[PDB]
Amino acid sequence: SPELRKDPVTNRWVIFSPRPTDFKSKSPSSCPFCIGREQECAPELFRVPDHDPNWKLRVIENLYPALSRNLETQSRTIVGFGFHDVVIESPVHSIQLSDIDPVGIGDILIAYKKRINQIAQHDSINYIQVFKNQGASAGASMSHSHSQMMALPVVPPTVSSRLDGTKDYFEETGKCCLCEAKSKHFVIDESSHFVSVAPFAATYPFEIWIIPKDHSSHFHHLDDVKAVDLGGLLKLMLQKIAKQLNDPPYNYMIHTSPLKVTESQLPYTHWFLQIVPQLSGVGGFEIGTGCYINPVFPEDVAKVMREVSLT
Amino acid sequence: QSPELRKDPVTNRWVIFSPTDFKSSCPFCIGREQECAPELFRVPDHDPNWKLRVIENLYPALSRNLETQSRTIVGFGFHDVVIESPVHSIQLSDIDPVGIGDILIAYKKRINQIAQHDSINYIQVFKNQGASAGASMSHSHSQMMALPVVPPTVSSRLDGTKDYFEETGKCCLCEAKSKHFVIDESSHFVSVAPFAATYPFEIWIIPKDHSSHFHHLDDVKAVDLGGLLKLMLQKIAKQLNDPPYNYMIHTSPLKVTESQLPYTHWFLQIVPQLSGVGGFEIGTGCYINPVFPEDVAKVMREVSL
Ligand SMILES: [Zn+2]
Ligand SMILES: [Zn+2]
Ligand SMILES: [Zn+2]
Ligand SMILES: [Zn+2]
C-alpha cells in the first residue's frame, strides 16, 4: 500500500512503497591505529585510561581533516574552520565495535561527551556531528575500528529541520515528539534508559533510532550507567542488523542539540542515535527532490527485528 | 588547500568546500511494446514508427489508482518512463540535439496533461544511466515522477530564493553570470558551475531569460537546450571517463502562486555519479565537496570532443 509519511524530527516526506524477509546486504593485519604505532597518527587529544600506556581508546586528530582548526580567528562564504577528529575504539586491530563489550562502548560514548564539552568551549563551533562509518561503500577508509566527529561553525538542515519540526509539533500537541516514541514509532527492543524503534516515516529500510526514554535535549548528558546501558542496546542493535541483513555496510549518527540552543527549544529538543544499514542507493528522484523512497515499512521492520534470534 | 563553506539561495544551504584530476536486446527495444506497461502517447503522435514513447512505469513508486483517495497521505501519484530512442544501442548524448528537443517537448506535453490534476503539487523529471548512479536498465532512458506534495528540495529552493529576493530585489538565477562560473552558453542557456555546488563537477544549465516554468519550453529553445545538454554530457564523459549520471530538472510546483514568480526559476542539474556518502552527510545533510567550481569550469571549458 504506497503512502507518504513525515516525522517532525526529520521533517521531509518519504515514500513507503515496497519482502522484509528477503532484504539483505549487497554492498591488512595492522595499521597506524593499532596499539604501539601512535607515532604514525596525527596529534592526540586524549586517551582512556587517562594518560595510560595500556589504553582502551584514544581521541586523536584526523590526519586529513575536512575542516581547518587553524581558521578560528578568521571565523555567502565562510572559512574552513573546524575540528575533524577521530575516536579510536579499540587497541586491537580486527575487532568490530559490535563485538566490543557494552561497558567498553559506554566508555567510547563517554569520550564523545568529554570532547564535545572540550569543543563547546569554542564560541565559533555551533554543532558537532558524532558519526561512525563502517564499510567501504559506507565510507570506511580504515579497517581498524573508529568513529568520526566534526565540529561546525553553522547549524545544518536536518537539525534546523528537526528543531523547526518538533517545535511545530510541540506548540500544538503540547508534547516533545520523541517523548511519544513508544506510541508513535514501532518498538524493537528496550533497555533501562533507552528504547529502539523503526521510525514511523523512516528514511532508509531497516533504519533505527535508539531513543532516550527520559527527555534529554543534548547527548553530552551521558552518564556512566546510561553509557553502559545504551552500549548494550547499541551492541544489540548492531548484532541483529549484522545477522538479519548479512553484515551490511552501516554507519551510525548521533543527533543532538545546536550548541547555543534556546531555553525554549529544550522541552521538544530530544537527542537519539540513528543506525542506517546500507541496503540500496538512490537515483535522480531523490537527489532531485530531497524525498526518499523506502521499500520497507517500519511495520514490517519492527516485526523482523523482534523475530531475530541471537543464539 | 584551505577549506571553505559557501551558500546559494537556490540550495539555501552551505556546502563544505574542502580541496582536471578526476575521472572514471531489451523490452525497450523497438518491437516489444505490448511487453511495456501502458502508453500515454508516443512521438511521432500515433506513429507505429516511433522515436520516443511516454509510458507508465511497470513498477510505480506511487500508485496511479489511489487517485480518488486524498503527517501521512495516500500513495497517489504518477510514475512514467520516457523511452528516449527505439534503438538499444545509443547514449542519450550520442543523440542528435533536435531529437533531444523531441524528448524535452514530450516532458512538456506530459506535464500539461498532469497539470490538469488538481491533486498534483510537483512534477520532477530525472535521468538515470549507469549502475552506480542508480540505473537498472542499460537502454538509454529517463523518468518522470508526479507527486501530491511539494518535496524537500523545492521547499528550500522557494525559501532560499524568496529570502534572497527580499534582499537585493533580484532573482539569483537571472544573475547567473555574476554568481556562477560560466563554462558555456547558447542563444538561450548558460550551463554553469554553481557558486556553491553540492557535488564535485556538478553542472547547472540555466535558461537565460526568466522562465519560472520548465513547461514554458518551446521548440527552438527545446533544441537549443539539447545542443548544450549534449555538449555538457559529452564533455563530462570525455574528461571524467564516462561516469554514470542523474540529471534533474528543477522547476516549479503546479500551485505556484503569483507572489513566487519573480524569484522562481527552472534549471537542469547534472551529477556525474562520483563522490561517495557516509555518516557525516547522513547525520548532517551538509555535503563536502573536494573540488571548487572555479577549477571545474576551467577544466570543462577546455574539453575537446
Ligand atoms: Zn588496523
Ligand atoms: Zn522528549
Ligand atoms: Zn532496448
Ligand atoms: Zn530569473
Swiss-Prot record, chain A:
Catalyzed reactions: alpha-D-glucose 1-phosphate + ADP + H(+) = ADP-alpha-D-glucose + phosphate
GO BP annotation list: carbohydrate metabolic process; galactose metabolic process; glucose metabolic process; positive regulation of cellular response to phosphate starvation
Molecular function GO terms recorded: ADP binding; nucleotidyltransferase activity; ribose-5-phosphate adenylyltransferase activity; UDP-glucose:hexose-1-phosphate uridylyltransferase activity; zinc ion binding
Cofactor(s) demanded: Zn(2+)
Binding-site list for ADP-alpha-D-glucose: E40, C41, A42, N62, N133, G139, A140, S141, M142, Q148, G281, F285, E286
A Pfam match: GalP_UDP_transf
Residues that bind Zn(2+) 2: C176, C179, H215, H270
Documented EC number(s): 2.7.7.-
Keywords: Carbohydrate metabolism, Glucose metabolism, Metal-binding, Nucleotidyltransferase, Transferase, Zinc
Annotated residues for binding of Zn(2+) 1: C31, C34, H93, H144
Xref: InterPro entries: ADP-glucose_phosphorylase (IPR053177), GalP_UDPtransf1 (IPR001937), GalP_Utransf_C (IPR005850), GalP_Utransf_N (IPR005849), HIT-like_sf (IPR036265)
Positions of the catalytic residues: H146 (tele-amp-histidine intermediate)
Cofactor comment text: Binds 2 zinc ions per subunit.
Further facts: Functions by a double-displacement chemical mechanism and ping-pong kinetics through a covalent nucleotidyl-enzyme intermediate.
Annotated function: Catalyzes the conversion of ADP-glucose and inorganic phosphate (Pi) into glucose-1-phosphate and ADP. Does not possess galactose-1-phosphate uridylyltransferase activity.
Entry protein name: ADP-glucose phosphorylase
UniProt source species: Arabidopsis thaliana (Mouse-ear cress)
Higher taxonomy: Eukaryota, Viridiplantae, Streptophyta, Embryophyta, Tracheophyta
